[PDB]
Design an enzyme around this catalytic site. Structure first.
Site, PDB file in Angstrom:
ATOM      1  N   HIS A  54       0.815  -1.214   0.000  1.00 60.34           N
ATOM      2  CA  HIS A  54       0.000   0.000   0.000  1.00 60.34           C
ATOM      3  C   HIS A  54       0.867   1.292   0.000  1.00 60.34           C
ATOM      4  O   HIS A  54       0.297   2.382  -0.050  1.00 60.34           O
ATOM      5  CB  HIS A  54      -1.096   0.015   1.078  1.00 60.34           C
ATOM      6  CG  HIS A  54      -0.594   0.230   2.471  1.00 60.34           C
ATOM      7  ND1 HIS A  54      -0.743  -0.735   3.437  1.00 60.34           N
ATOM      8  CD2 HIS A  54       0.053   1.287   3.007  1.00 60.34           C
ATOM      9  CE1 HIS A  54      -0.178  -0.248   4.527  1.00 60.34           C
ATOM     10  NE2 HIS A  54       0.323   0.963   4.314  1.00 60.34           N
ATOM     11  N   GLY A 108       2.637   6.411   9.660  1.00 58.25           N
ATOM     12  CA  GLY A 108       4.058   6.382   9.351  1.00 58.25           C
ATOM     13  C   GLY A 108       4.743   5.124   9.854  1.00 58.25           C
ATOM     14  O   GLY A 108       5.869   4.852   9.428  1.00 58.25           O
ATOM     15  N   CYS A 115       3.753   1.872   9.420  1.00 57.13           N
ATOM     16  CA  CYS A 115       3.651   0.744   8.510  1.00 57.13           C
ATOM     17  C   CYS A 115       5.000   0.334   7.974  1.00 57.13           C
ATOM     18  O   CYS A 115       5.840   1.188   7.690  1.00 57.13           O
ATOM     19  CB  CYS A 115       2.667   1.033   7.385  1.00 57.13           C
ATOM     20  SG  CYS A 115       0.983   1.363   7.950  1.00 57.13           S
TER      21      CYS A 115
HETATM   22  C1  LIG Z   1       0.629   2.857   6.912  1.00 60.65           C
HETATM   23  O1  LIG Z   1       1.079   2.700   5.574  1.00 60.65           O
HETATM   24  C2  LIG Z   1       1.178   4.178   7.422  1.00 60.65           C
HETATM   25  O2  LIG Z   1       2.352   4.395   7.692  1.00 60.65           O
HETATM   26  N1  LIG Z   1       0.169   5.078   7.470  1.00 60.65           N
HETATM   27  C3  LIG Z   1      -1.033   4.506   7.099  1.00 60.65           C
HETATM   28  C4  LIG Z   1      -2.315   5.077   6.986  1.00 60.65           C
HETATM   29  C5  LIG Z   1      -2.595   6.524   7.191  1.00 60.65           C
HETATM   30  O3  LIG Z   1      -1.744   7.363   7.356  1.00 60.65           O
HETATM   31  O4  LIG Z   1      -3.905   6.787   7.153  1.00 60.65           O
HETATM   32  C6  LIG Z   1      -4.286   8.182   7.242  1.00 60.65           C
HETATM   33  C7  LIG Z   1      -3.389   4.263   6.618  1.00 60.65           C
HETATM   34  C8  LIG Z   1      -3.170   2.923   6.357  1.00 60.65           C
HETATM   35 BR1  LIG Z   1      -4.609   1.863   5.724  1.00 60.65          BR
HETATM   36  C9  LIG Z   1      -1.921   2.350   6.473  1.00 60.65           C
HETATM   37  C10 LIG Z   1      -0.845   3.152   6.829  1.00 60.65           C
END
Ligand SMILES: *[C@]1(O)C(=O)Nc2c(C(=O)OC)cc(Br)cc21
Ligand SMILES: *[C@]1(O)C(=O)Nc2c(C(=O)OC)cc(Br)cc21
Lengths: 304, 304
Positions: B41, B143, B145
């Site tokens: 993603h 951030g 993820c």
């Molecule tokens: C991860 O990729 C990440 O680091 N942020 C994030 C969000 C986000 O910032 O949402 C506003 C959403 C997801 Br589904 C996954 C992740």
């Protein structure tokens, strides 16, 4: 979301851990620049620990008696000195992995991470708090002495603790990196009892703010209190008295949640008076006191 | 003595964390050898996440669109591929800090450490367990993820988790290092609810053995039970059914303490039926289920 008992990443401290052997006693040392810091009781036999005279014991020791091993390589010891309850072993090689560092003597209530080590090798990392009675509730087995407590600010490691002893009550005592013990403890195998282990009130309030930020709000009530009224309740429950300095430090958490500090004090007051009633807050059935207001802000913002 | 929620030393994994940016989405990547592993993603805008077709989205991406930064230095991307829900970015430089590693898909009940990261930089380390409903109860902000879960055996890091999502209930979902999600979760911004979060029975028993080894014995009773009788109680309290395999794995703890597994099951049974009555076990007012029998043995022996 989610709130965890989090320790600092340990890599910067792993690169400093060494093994120190003197005679038949082996423990951990901290290698920073060309100096290895370790508990002075490395020179003791378990028999010497009953009543040691460290100055006298140290006279019988030379540089070559202190075997320092970093990984599988031996460090040459070219000097040795006793500073309070720590030994400083000057080695001929500066640690190439030395991070930016400071030695800090923390106050009770402050939290830090511990890299538990055995034979200069790290086993695990966990978060501690210096208790108000100057003990820490760690996890240390024989061979763990010399494991250090630290905090990290971006790239600078502030070393605050070095493990020295386990009291007969299963709690832990040790020094700052200058060799001065936290509390009244002495590096001797003798009866040393801890004082009252009070709850760090400012930390519980900070953790209640973390719970609100993460969705747990059942404990929020319609009441407020004063510092003096709250403190009468805190005394009864062996909680540290809350000061205006503590209130000031909770300011950013109060600002973020919109909950005044004294309103959270009233919530804490009812939690003390009524209990949890079988309920939980951030997966805990007791009031957590090992997160400072700084730790809550750090975890809830993403500081690296 | 002392028993703590301990994470593995994180240094070996800190040396693998990188930042991955694709368009305006930035997350963490894991750099092992000449490959950077990250959630697929990274190619999505928050708008694409409502209903992404990853194969279609990936067609519009070239090697030069994936910006990989290790510290302050840029890695050259020479290949890219999608394996399940992870992207594998072939870089022209092998990570000089690559530890000995394996990719393992853990079972629920198993524990691991998480190095929470932001912009390729580590913020903290904590211990998790893969819940029986295939979620983890972490601490992850936007951030985070691409932050990974791992276990360490001497010098070999077994990577088991990569963080991908936060469910609307504040719990976390993610994949193994092959990109396969634990549980039924999908990398999509849609309503995904977790199943029942049952208690990991074998882990609670292991933690009760750790409590006995560390002095907390008030909960030991004069009773015993059978696997079938214990399991009737475990079903009522949403505890995982205990099998003979679980009993076998508790064997070394039973041998060390001299307490038969079924006797500890009876103690657990009375703790479930009567509660703690305001008492604590290893500083907890609830039954801890995030220590495996292997974690208890490791912590109580000093494995590095
Ligand atoms: C991860 O990729 C990440 O680091 N942020 C994030 C969000 C986000 O910032 O949402 C506003 C959403 C997801 Br589904 C996954 C992740
Ligand atoms: C630390 O130096 C250590 O690593 N072990 C240890 C013992 C010990 O092994 O006792 C049997 C005792 C003390 Br007072 C301190 C230390």
């Amino acid at each position: 979301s989610g709130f965890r008992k989090m320790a600092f990443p340990s890599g910067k401290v792993e690169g400093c851990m060494v093994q120190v052997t003197c005679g038949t006693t082996t423990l951990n040392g901290l290698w920073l620049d060309d100096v290895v810091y370790c508990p002075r009781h490395v020179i003791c036999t378990s028999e010497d620990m009953l009543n040691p005279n460290y100055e006298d014991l140290l006279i019988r020791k030379s540089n070559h008696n202190f075997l320092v091993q970093a990984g599988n390589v031996q460090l040459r010891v070219i000097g040795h000195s006793m500073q309070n309850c720590v030994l400083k072993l000057k080695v001929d090689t500066a640690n190439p992995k030395t991070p930016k560092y400071k030695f800090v003597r923390i106050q009770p209530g402050q939290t830090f991470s511990v890299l538990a080590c055995y034979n200069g090798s790290p086993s695990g990392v966990y978060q501690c708090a210096m208790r108000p009675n100057f003990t820490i509730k760690g996890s240390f087995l024989n061979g763990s002495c010399g494991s250090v407590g630290f905090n990290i600010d971006y790239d600078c490691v502030s070393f605050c603790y070095m493990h020295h002893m386990e009291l007969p009550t299963g709690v832990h005592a040790g020094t700052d990196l200058e060799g001065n013990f936290y509390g009244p403890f002495v590096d001797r195998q003798t009866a040393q009892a801890a004082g009252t282990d009070t709850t760090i009130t400012v930390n519980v309030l900070a953790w209640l703010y973390a719970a609100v930020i993460n969705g747990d709000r059942w404990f929020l009530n319609r009441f407020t209190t004063t510092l003096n009224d709250f403190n009468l309740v805190a005394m009864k429950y062996n909680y540290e008295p809350l000061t205006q300095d503590h209130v000031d430090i909770l300011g950013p958490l109060s600002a973020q949640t919109g909950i005044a500090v004294l309103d959270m004090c009233a919530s804490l007051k009812e939690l003390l008076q009524n209990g949890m009633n079988g309920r939980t807050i951030l997966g805990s059935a007791l009031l957590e006191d090992e997160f400072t207001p700084f730790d809550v802000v750090r975890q809830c913002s993403g500081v690296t």
